[PDB]
Structure formats: structure tokens, C-alpha cells
Design a protein around this ligand. Structure first.
Ligand SMILES: Nc1ncnc2c1ncn2[C@@H]1O[C@H](COP(=O)(O)OP(=O)(O)O)[C@@H](O)[C@H]1O
Ligand SMILES: Nc1ncnc2c1ncn2[C@@H]1O[C@H](COP(=O)(O)OP(=O)(O)O)[C@@H](O)[C@H]1O
Length: 1182
């Protein structure tokens, strides 16, 4: 209905031209079966000659005279047919592609310009609706679909219907029996495709549920990565992950099995129809003059028409996607929300020293996060006053500044400019009397001259000069090469934040306004710049009424009037003295303040290198593809033999040969093709299956064996890694299938065709290869030309979009209106360049396609041309005329598949790059020894000497600078201080995750780096500051066995008892075997921390590590957990990094750490007796 009605918006010539396009489209479509009627005619005469030459056999010289004269006469008319249709189909070709560019061009240009223009004219609304910059993304995709909707695709659709319905017209008239037979296979072929779609829908959801587990198991483990290494539960998360893989491979293969059978059987019913047509076609020969070979050909083209319906379907999908995308932005495009925004027309008053008078204003933001920021306002400011706003954040100081522009229309009351209504008058004019100095001084990246020039479209370079000088912006322009003509470089790097603000002050001075609205125009600057901007602001004031917003109370001292706010309600009014004397809000504030996915080196067939390593057998698939490839010509030769025994040979046994060939056609084709196709299907099926396992196996097991700048700093999120495993293993699954797919078409065209060529006339071979290789290259060279024009188009539109997106993302473009239409001039000038490229590529796209359809007729041309003459005179044969047409169609399926597997190989290579860099390794925690798991190395005195550290992201302050520590056995090492002191970092280096940039840490003398990995996970008592459960039952969470670990009933009991989680274990029936579910994210914190403790003491370490388990908990929970801790330590090292210094007083050695530097160190009572750092930390904690 409505979807395409809006879509048209077709110009004066366009609406006419839509009809010219339709009009060429029919007659383009029609010409192909008419062209094939001539092919039937050439058959008809050859038969009228052959049946009497063979059935008389009483002359051979009469036949050489009279029979060849009719053939000669017929050939004179043939010459004027193929040339005529060719000359039509050439022109109409160019016309339908001109539809593609020229009509679309003018639509896109209209859309783009309306879009950019409607946006600047609706102000607020664009910002209200969705998020800025996502709009120019979606818009630039939309205008691409426009090319497709006003595209030649529509023309192709009409053309398709003409070959179809129009095919049946000629069919019906030359014989109506066979019409009914073709009309019946259409519902059969449609039923079969219907089972296909069913199989697809069922098997997809199945692969998805299966892979779902493999993604959930892989997701949680790789985020919990530091914890799982540390308890040594790797081999179990590996096995569980392997478990999901065994089930996923069996649904993957059944899918492949079903796909081949559905697809095999599909081709079967096509082959049956192809035979069936002949069999019922023959019945019209032997006993009737009803078919003379006309309908036999004409009905083959009706099948090509039925496939033309299949080509329609994409055309339609392009059109739907084009309308749907369009009508949704049409909504913002056409229809501004308006009547509180606009930008154009209305009355203009005269403002000389406007007042600000606020009358009973309450307002709320759209988001219902902050509702009524403003509520009840009476403020009356006389001209030549300076009003100060002090408050709290939520007073909506920003809100009053928006209402003043008339961006919103206030909920209650009105704000009256010069005591006159602000909702009656033109916005534009209103904007010009009101200067605004922004809280973000972001500007365009254009010349210093252009930035002053945005303030009024009349500033001469003198005034620019005058501007920078009073605005004390006159410094940086001189340092900068080229004075004013210095373009603001990069993304803003030629200017400080301070310098930007200075350009904005200079600009608001150039505008000469009577209201000056200063929003953090003295706040967010350094102590030096502050004075500089203040003096400039002073010089800009005292000739105008102004409102200054500042958080700096030193500048609000000297304001004429201060007005207090505590939430939106105007509380104080008076000047400095009046406020301070009463002790208002103001007096209150005085007192408070006093990619990684683009791998660079490209593969060189590393695909098949790695495939071939994990390859075990299957030489039969490719061999089966070769025979299935030569199997295709057996039909075409058989069809020659059909029409063969009908053209030449008398009436006796014509029928018999056809009956025999019918049966032969069945057994040779339908039956063997299914078998041999399923054999190839079993081969690439199992190939992708075992790749699907082994790859995901070989990545994920290698992942648990890596750490460090991808698990000690991920540069691709967990979900993106899981995505990579998905996509990759699926992609190779299709890749193996593409190998055999190329071999299939290769023997199918080139190979078997050669055999066929040897039985040609030796001239035909020569003539033929002057077509077939040429038309192949010619479609490829079209693809090349297609992408070449596309690539250059994307660059041009990128620049017009870049300058658009920069304006819309800046909310300060809406503040101005003066540079809006200036901006819309530039957008116009930029959009003219694609207009010209659209006209240039109209002839380019136009001439390529015309030349492709010119080679179709030229084939048929050389075919019938040469087929007569020297060949008709002597050595006339029924066959090799139909094989030429097959050869044309063999190049079609070769070029088509070759182009198809171009993106297949691309994505296959990319998948390979990933699998190679995983195989490339980072060889940290691969497994090492320096002991035999000796039990006389237990604890030690662990040394840290001269250790510096800074994260793999370098800008984040180096947290360890000059750190050296010591820890003696049997003693709790507290570590206290404050954040960013490398508290946590110390625990990380003792666990062996990302060891320090410089310096070293030793056990007894052997580095952590060379420490025995296995024994290290039976030497840790780690506790997270976020403990997280696994999908495993609580019993299995609590304890995890391995070949480094044991588990037992008695163990989990003692762990739960000691950890005090046993309270919670009691509740819930099945006790320990009770599963919570939902990744056990349903537990309360107290429960969680205990669960981490129970894990800790299972490992039987002599080192406990505690990560903020009293700053992630509160109350009785902290205490109970400290009790679990107290009974665990029976005289062993513990690390408490916790920031509650009130529960640290038991620690034997407290280290006060500043930025890697031990400041004070010692036992509690010493440090506490000091009035130094430590005591100050305990004082301030409480
Ligand atoms: N237009 C806005 N809508 C929503 N939040 C805003 C907006 N502008 C600023 N903010 C943020 O919300 C905070 C408080 O809201 P606001 O009503 O602007 O209080 P105030 O202007 O008095 O500081 C600001 O400090 C800022 O971080
Ligand atoms: N793997 C990491 N990569 C990047 N930054 C990290 C990583 N780990 C932690 N950080 C960040 O570095 C901060 C400071 O580190 P650290 O001094 O160890 O913290 P704290 O002393 O408060 O426990 C962390 O609080 C966090 O914001």
C-alpha cells in the first residue's frame, strides 16, 4: 500500500521518464523468446530438408540444388533478425540503466539536502530523538538503497515478467497440450522448495542452542580468567567446554546430511521435468504435425522464465529494504516537530537593553531521571545589572539558559524579554541579541579568521584583528604560522582548552549582543588563565545586561546581584552584602569551600596447509565432483540426440529411439547425480565438522595456556572472542565446500567441453573460442568496473558526511543560527560533486551492460552464420548447434561461482589469520619447573627488590615506583595506604600474572617467573573483591580437583564449616548438591566472599591473599568473615590489602605504601604511637 506511494516524489521529467523506463523494459524482455523463435525456425527447415533426404534416397544432386536454395533464402531473412533485435536490445539496455543513476541521483540529492536543512530548522528535536551521529550513519546507508529502489532492479523485475507470461503466449499458440504440462510442474517445484525452507528453519535453531553452551562456558571462564588459573581448575573448564563441542558436531553433520538430500532431490525433479517435457513433446511429433520443434524450444525458454521469477525476488527485497529504510527517516525529514523551535518567520520587536524577567517557571527535562530541576521562579533583573547564579547541581542553571533561547517553551509561566513575550517572536532575531559563551568551547576545525566569522556574516578582518586583541587571544595566532589563516589542525591539538575559550569570548564580543549569557566562562581554567579571561570578560561587560554563572565565588563577589538556589526555588536575592549578612545559600557555599582484528601479513594458502595437517582421508569427494561435473554434458548431448532423431532420419523407429533415450536419461542422470553429489556432500561435510571441533578445541585450550596483554589487558572484549570462534569455524566449514565447488565447475565447462570440441569441424573450435573466453572476461571486467566506481563514491560521501556529523554532534551549532545556513551552502557545494559523478557513471554502467547484451545476440549470430554456408554445403549434422548454447551457459555457471568464492576465500583467509596468531603464542604459563614439588620450600622469605610496574596501557601513572619489600614466614603482612599505590599489583606479581617491567621477585632465590606452576596453585589462598560462581553446582564451585588436586566429601565439609558458609548450605534441600543457577549471581555478597574463602583453604596453602573483602561487605557479614579468616591462619603468611584500617591492628607488620614507596613501616602499636602518616590514616578512616 502506502510504502511505495510516498517513495515516489518524482520531479517534472522523472514522472514521465518512469514510464519510458517501464516502456523499454517490456520490449527488452519480450525480445529474448522472439529471438529464440528464430532458433526454432532454423530447426524447422533443417527437419523439412532432412526427413525427405533420408526417406527418398533416390537423388543426392537434386538435394544439393533446391534444398540449399530454400536454406539460402531463409538465411537472408536470418541476417536481418539477429542484427535488428540486437540493435533494439542495445538501446533499451542503456535506457534502463539510465533509470539507475539519473532518476536516483536527483532523489538522493533532494533527500540529503532536505535532511541537512530540516535538521538545522527544527533545533531541539533532532537531539531529542535518538542519539547524535548515529543519524548520519543510518542516513548515508539509506541513500545507497535509493540507488536500488529507483534502480534498474525494478526494470529487471518487469523484464522478468515479460520473459515469463509473454513466454507462455507464444507457447500456448504453437501448442496448448505442452502448456498444461509446464503449468503443472510449477506447483511441484514450489512444494519442494517449501520443504527446503522447513529444514533450514529447524536445523538453524538447533546449531544455535548447541553453540549456546559453548559460548556461555567460554564467556564466563575467560572473564574469570585470573581466578581459574589461580585454583588450577583449567582442565575441567576445558573438558566441560569439550562436552558442548561433542554435541554441536552431531547436529552440524545432520544439517549437512539433510542439506545434501533436500538439494539433491531438488535437482532431480528439475531433471525429471526436463525429460518429461521431451517425452510428451514427442507424442506431438510422431502422431501429429502439432509440434515441428517450435514448442520444444519455446518451452525451454518458459523454464528460463520460471527461474526469472527467482531473480525477481531479490529485486523486490531491495525495494522493500529501500522503502522501509526511507519511510522511517521521511518522518524526521518531512514534519519538523515545531511550535517551540522552528527557525524562520515571526515578528521582530526592538531590543535595546532587554530585561530578563522570569515569571513563575517550573520545568522538567524529557528523561525522567531529573524531573522539575526548576520549580517556581520569580526573578526580575533591571537593565545594566549583572546577575549571579550560585546553587547546587540539580538547580537547573543550564535549564534557564535554554528557556531564554526558546529552545523549549516552559511548562509553567513564561519568560518575558524586554517585558515582552518570547514565544511570539522570531527565534533567529532573538538568538542574535543573546550571546552565549558555552561550557564546552568546541568549534569547527577551520581558520582563526573563519571562527570569528561564524559569529556574524559581515565581520571584516579588522574586526577579527580588534577581537583577538581585546580577547587576549592575540598571542597564539602569532606563535602559529600564518596568523589568521592558520587552520585549526587535527581534532583540536593546535589549541589548549584555554585557548578555545578565548576564541569563544572573542566571538561573543564580535556578535555585539544586549544579553550575554556566560556559562563556565571563568570556571574549568587554571589559576593563571583565570585572571586573563576575567579581565577580558570585565571589558566585555558593563555595556550590556549579563548573567554570569560561576562556581568560583571570588568572581561572584563583585557581581551586582546574587540569587540563591537550593533546588530550583529562588531562595536568596540581594547583592554580596545582603546575602552574607543574612547567612543564605551563598554564605553556606563560602563556608564549604573555605584493529586487533586486522592482522597485517596476508596468508599464502596457509588455509589448505593447516587443513591438510588435520586431514585424515577423502579423495572420493573431489573425484566424485569431477565425474558429477562431466555428468552435466550427458544431458545436453542426449537432448541433441532427441531433436536428432526428429531432424534427420525417416519416420520408421523415430519413436523407438526416443523411448529408449527417455529411460536412459533417467538412469544416467537422476540416480547417479544424487549419489555422486551426496558423496561430495559427505566429504566437505565431514571436513567442516572435524574443523569445527578441532579449531575451537585448538584455540580454547591454547587460551587457558595464555595470559598477559590479553587476559592481563584484553584489547578485544570476551564476547568478541567467542564471536571469533563462532564465525571462524563456520567460515572454514563453507571454505572446504568451495574447494570441491571450483573442481566441479572446472571439469564441467573447460574439461568436458574440450572432448566435445574434438568431434567439431575444427573450424568451429576456432570460431567458438573467439566467443566463449571473451564473454567470460567481459563479465568479470564488469565486476571490476562496478567496484571501481563504488570505491571512489564511498570516499566522496564520507567527506560530505564528516562535515555534517561534526555539526550535529556539536550541540553549540544549535546555539548559533548565523553559521547554520552558511553551513548549508557548503553542503550543497560538496553534494554537487557526487551529482556530477552520478552523471558520468550513468554512461559507464550504461555502456557495460549494453555491451553484455550485445554479446548474447552476437553469439547466436556467429552460430547461425557459420552454421550455414561452408557447413550447410557439405558436412551438415544435427548436433553441435545445441552444444554451442550449452557452452554459453557453462561459462555462466563458471564466472558466477568464481565470483562467489572470491568473498569466501577472503573471509577464509581472515579466519586463518586468527588461527595462526593464536598458534604464534605468547608463552607465558605454558609450564615450567625449578623444583619437583619439594615440601621443604614451604613459605620462605619472599623478596621484592627494586620493582617498578606500570600496566600495558602506559598512561595510567606507574603505580610501583622504587618498591622493595620483605615478608617473613608465619606473619601477616598488611598493606595499607590509598588507591593507585600498587596494593593489588603486589598480589598480582606474587601470583604470576604480568611480572614487572623492572626489578625481580624471588621465592628463596628462584624467581616467580621460573616457579613450578602446579605447586604454586597449591600455595595460594586467593580471595577476590568480586567472587564469582561457575555454572557448576556449589559443591563443584567450592572444590575443584585436577592432577594437582584431589577432592572428597570430608574435604568440602571442612571447607564449608571453616568458611562459615555452612549456614547457607543447611538451608535449601539436597544440601551441597543444591544448584542455585543463573551463574550464581543470585547470591548475596556475604555468601560470595565466604565461598571464595572455602576455595582458599581447600588448596591447603600457607599463603593467604585477601582482596578487599571488608570494603565489599558491611556489618555482621564483615565480622563473620574475619572469624573464618582468624581460624584459618594457624601461624602462616597472609596479605590483607583491605582499606579498613579498623580491622587491621592484628597485622604484625603494617606497611604504609605511597606510590611504590614505603613511607612508614612497622607493627601497629609503634605506628599508632607516631603522629605521622599511619595514625592520620586510622583517624581519617573513622
Ligand atoms: N541538559 C541536560 N540534561 C541532563 N543533565 C544535564 C544537562 N546539562 C547538564 N547536565 C548534567 O546534570 C547535572 C545537574 O543537572 P542541572 O539541572 O544542569 O543542574 P546545575 O545546572 O544547577 O548544575 C549537571 O551538573 C550535568 O553534569
Ligand atoms: N589489567 C589491567 N589493565 C588496565 N588497568 C588496570 C588493570 N587492572 C587494574 N587496572 C586499573 O588500575 C587501577 C589501579 O591499580 P592498583 O594500584 O593495583 O589499585 P588499588 O591499589 O586501589 O587496589 C585499578 O583500580 C584499575 O582502575
Amino acid at each position: 500500500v502506502s510504502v511505495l506511494t510516498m517513495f515516489r516524489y518524482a520531479g517534472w521529467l522523472d514522472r514521465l521518464y518512469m514510464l519510458v523506463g517501464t516502456l523499454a523494459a517490456i520490449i527488452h524482455g519480450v525480445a529474448l523468446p522472439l529471438m529464440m523463435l528464430i532458433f526454432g525456425d532454423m530447426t524447422d527447415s533443417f527437419a523439412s530438408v532432412g526427413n525427405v533426404s533420408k526417406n527418398s534416397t533416390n537423388m543426392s544432386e537434386a538435394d544439393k540444388r533446391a534444398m540449399f536454395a530454400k536454406l539460402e533464402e531463409e538465411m537472408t531473412t536470418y541476417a536481418y533478425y539477429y542484427t535488428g533485435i540486437g540493435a533494439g536490445v542495445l538501446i533499451v539496455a542503456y535506457i534502463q540503466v539510465s533509470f539507475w543513476c539519473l532518476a536516483a541521483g536527483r532523489q538522493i540529492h533532494k533527500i540529503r539536502q532536505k535532511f541537512f536543512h530540516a535538521i538545522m530548522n527544527q533545533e531541539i528535536g533532532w537531539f531529542d530523538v535518538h542519539d547524535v551521529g548515529e543519524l548520519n550513519t543510518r542516513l548515508t546507508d539509506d541513500v545507497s538503497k535509493i540507488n536500488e529502489g529507483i534502480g534498474d532492479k525494478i526494470g529487471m523485475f518487469f523484464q522478468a515478467m515479460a520473459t515469463f507470461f509473454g513466454g507462455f503466449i507464444i507457447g500456448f499458440t504453437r501448442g496448448w497440450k505442452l502448456t498444461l504440462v509446464i503449468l503443472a510442474i510449477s506447483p511441484v517445484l514450489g512444494l519442494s522448495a517449501g520443504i527446503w525452507a522447513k529444514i533450514l528453519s529447524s536445523f538453524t535453531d538447533k546449531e544455535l542452542h548447541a553453540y549456546a553452551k559453548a559460548g556461555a562456558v567460554a564467556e564466563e571462564v575467560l572473564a574469570a580468567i585470573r581466578t581459574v588459573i589461580a585454583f588450577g581448575g583449567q582442565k575441567k573448564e576445558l573438558e566441560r567446554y569439550n562436552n558442548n563441542l561433542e554435541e554441536a558436531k552431531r547436529l552440524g553433520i545432520k544439517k549437512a546430511i539433510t542439506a545434501n538430500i533436500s538439494m539433491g532431490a531438488a535437482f532431480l525433479l528439475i531433471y525429471a521435468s526436463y525429460a518429461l517435457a521431451f517425452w510428451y513433446g514427442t507424442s506431438l511429433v510422431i502422431s501429429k504435425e502439432y509440434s515441428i520443434g517450435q514448442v520444444l524450444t519455446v518451452f525451454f525458454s518458459v523454464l528460463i522464465g520460471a527461474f526469472s521469477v527467482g531473480q525477481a525476488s531479490p529485486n523486490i527485497e531491495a525495494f522493500a529494504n529501500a522503502r522501509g529504510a526511507a519511510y522511517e527517516v521521511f518522518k524526521i525529514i518531512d514534519n519538523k516537530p515545531s511550535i517551540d523551535s522552528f527557525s524562520k518567520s515571526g515578528h521582530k520587536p526592538d531590543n535595546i537593553q532587554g530585561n530578563l524577567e522570569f515569571k513563575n517557571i517550573h520545568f522538567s527535562y524529557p528523561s525522567r531521571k531529573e524531573v522539575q530541576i526548576l520549580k517556581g521562579l520569580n526573578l526580575k533583573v533591571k537593565s545594566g545589572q549583572t546577575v549571579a547564579l550560585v546553587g547546587n547541581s540539580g538547580c537547573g542553571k543550564s535549564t534557564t539558559v535554554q528557556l531564554m533561547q526558546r529552545l523549549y517553551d516552559p511548562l509553567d509561566g513564561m519568560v518575558s524579554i524586554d517585558g515582552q513575550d518570547i514565544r511570539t517572536i522570531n527565534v533567529r532575531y532573538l538568538r542574535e541579541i543573546i550571546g552565549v559563551v558555552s561550557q564546552e568551547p568546541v568549534l569547527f576545525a577551520t581558520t582563526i579568521a573563519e571562527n570569528i566569522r561564524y559569529g556574524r556574516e559581515d565581520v571584516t578582518m579588522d574586526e577579527i584583528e580588534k577581537a583577538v586583541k581585546e580577547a587576549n587571544a592575540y598571542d597564539f595566532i602569532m606563535k602559529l604560522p600564518h596568523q589568521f589563516d592558520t587552520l585549526v589542525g587535527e581534532r583540536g591539538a593546535q589549541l589548549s582548552g584555554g585557548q578555545k575559550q578565548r576564541i569563544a569570548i572573542a566571538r561573543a564580543l564580535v556578535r555585539n549582543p544586549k544579553i550575554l549569557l556566560l556559562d563556565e566562562a571563568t570556571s574549568a581554567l587554571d589559576t593563571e588563565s583565570e585572571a586573563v579571561v576575567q579581565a577580558a570578560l570585565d571589558k566585555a561587560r558593563e555595556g550590556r545586561t549579563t548573567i554570569v554563572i560561576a562556581h568560583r565565588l571570588s568572581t561572584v563577589r563583585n557581581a551586582d546581584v546574587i540569587a540563591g538556589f537550593d533546588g530550583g526555588v529562588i531562595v536568596e536575592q540581594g547583592n554580596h552584602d545582603e546575602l552574607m549578612r543574612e547567612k543564605g545559600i551563598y554564605f553556606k557555599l563560602v563556608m564549604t569551600q573555605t584493529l586487533d582484528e586486522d592482522v597485517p601479513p596476508a596468508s599464502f594458502w596457509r588455509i589448505l596447509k593447516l587443513n591438510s595437517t588435520e586431514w585424515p582421508y577423502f579423495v572420493v569427494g573431489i573425484f566424485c565432483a569431477i565425474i558429477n561435473g562431466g555428468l552435466q554434458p550427458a544431458f545436453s548431448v542426449i537432448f541433441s540426440k532427441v531433436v536428432g532423431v526428429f531432424t534427420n532420419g525417416g519416420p520408421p523407429e523415430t519413436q523407438r529411439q526416443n523411448s529408449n533415450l527417455f529411460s536412459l536419461l533417467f538412469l544416467i542422470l537422476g540416480i547417479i547425480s544424487f549419489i555422486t553429489f551426496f558423496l561430495q556432500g559427505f566429504t566437505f561435510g565431514k571436513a567442516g565438522e572435524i574443523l569445527t571441533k578441532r579449531l575451537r578445541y585448538m584455540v580454547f585450550k591454547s587460551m587457558l595456556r595464555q595470559d598477559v596483554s590479553w587476559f592481563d589487558d584484553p584489547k578485544n572484549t570476551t564476547g568478541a572472542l567467542t564471536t571469533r570462534l563462532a564465525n571462524d569455524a563456520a567460515q572454514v566449514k563453507g571454505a572446504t565446500g568451495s574447494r570441491l565447488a571450483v573442481i566441479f565447475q572446472n571439469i564441467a565447462n573447460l574439461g568436458t567441453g574440450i572432448i566435445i570440441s574434438l568431434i567439431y569441424g575444427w573450424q568451429l573450435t576456432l570460431l567458438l573460442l573467439a566467443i566463449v573466453p571473451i564473454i567470460a572476461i567481459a563479465g568479470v571486467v564488469e565486476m571490476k568496473m562496478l567496484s571501481g566506481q563504488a570505491l571512489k563514491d564511498k570516499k566522496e560521501l564520507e567527506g560530505s558526511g564528516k562535515i555534517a556529523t561534526e555539526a550535529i554532534e556539536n550541540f553549540r551549532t544549535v546555539v548559533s543560527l548565523t553559521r547554520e545556513q552558511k553551513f548549508e551552502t557548503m553542503y550543497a557545494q560538496s553534494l554537487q560533486i557526487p551529482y556530477r559523478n552520478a552523471m558520468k557513471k550513468a554512461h559507464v554502467f550504461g555502456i557495460t551492460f549494453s555491451f553484455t547484451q550485445a554479446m548474447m545476440y552476437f553469439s547466436y549470430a556467429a552460430c547461425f552464420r557459420f552454421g550455414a554456408y561452408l557447413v550447410t554445403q557439405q558436412l551438415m549434422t544435427f548436433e553441435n548447434v545445441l552444444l554451442v548454447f550449452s557452452a554459453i551457459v557453462f561459462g555462466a555457471m563458471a564466472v558466477g561461482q568464481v565470483s562467489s568464492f572470491a568473498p569466501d576465500y577472503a573471509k577464509a583467509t581472515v579466519s586463518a589469520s586468527h588461527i595462526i596468531r593464536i598458534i604464534e603464542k605468547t608463552p607465558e604459563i605454558d609450564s615450567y619447573s625449578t623444583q619437583g614439588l619439594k615440601p621443604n620450600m614451604l613459605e620462605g622469605n619472599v623478596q621484592f627488590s627494586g620493582v617498578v610496574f606500570n600496566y600495558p596501557t602506559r598512561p595510567s601513572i606507574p603505580v610501583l615506583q622504587g618498591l622493595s619489600l620483605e615478608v617473613k614466614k608465619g606473619q601477616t603482612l598488611a598493606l595499607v595506604g590509598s588507591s593507585g599505590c600498587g596494593k593489588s599489583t603486589v598480589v598480582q606479581l606474587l601470583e604470576r600474572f604480568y611480572d614487572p617491567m623492572a626489578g625481580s621477585v624471588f621465592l628463596d632465590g628462584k624467581e616467580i617467573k621460573q616457579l613450578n606452576v602446579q605447586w604454586l596453585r597449591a600455595q595460594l589462598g586467593i580471595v577476590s573483591q568480586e567472587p564469582i560462581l561457575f555454572d557448576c553446582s556449589i559443591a563443584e564451585n567450592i572444590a575443584y580437583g585436577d592432577n594437582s588436586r584431589v577432592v572428597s566429601y570430608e574435604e568440602i565439609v571442612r571447607a564449608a564449616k571453616e568458611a562459615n558458609i555452612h549456614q547457607f548450605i543447611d538451608s535449601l534441600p539436597d544440601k551441597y548438591n543444591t544448584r542455585v543457577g543463573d551463574k550464581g549471581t543470585q547470591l548475596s555478597g556475604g555468601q560470595k566472599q565466604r565461598i571464595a574463602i572455602a576455595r582458599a583453604l581447600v588448596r591447603q596453602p600457607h599463603i593467604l591473599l585477601l582482596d578487599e573483602a571488608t570494603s565489599a561487605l558491611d556489618t555482621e557479614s564483615e565480622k563473620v568473615v574475619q572469624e573464618a579468616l582468624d581460624k584459618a591462619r594457624e601461624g602462616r603468611t597472609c596479605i590483607v590489602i583491605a582499606h579498613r584500617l579498623s580491622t587491621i591492628q592484628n597485622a604484625d607488620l603494617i606497611v604504609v605504601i605511597q606510590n611504590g614507596k614505603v613511607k612508614e613501616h612497622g607493627t601497629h602499636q609503634q605506628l599508632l604511637a607516631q603522629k605521622g602518616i599511619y595514625f592520620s590514616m586510622v583517624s581519617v578512616q573513622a
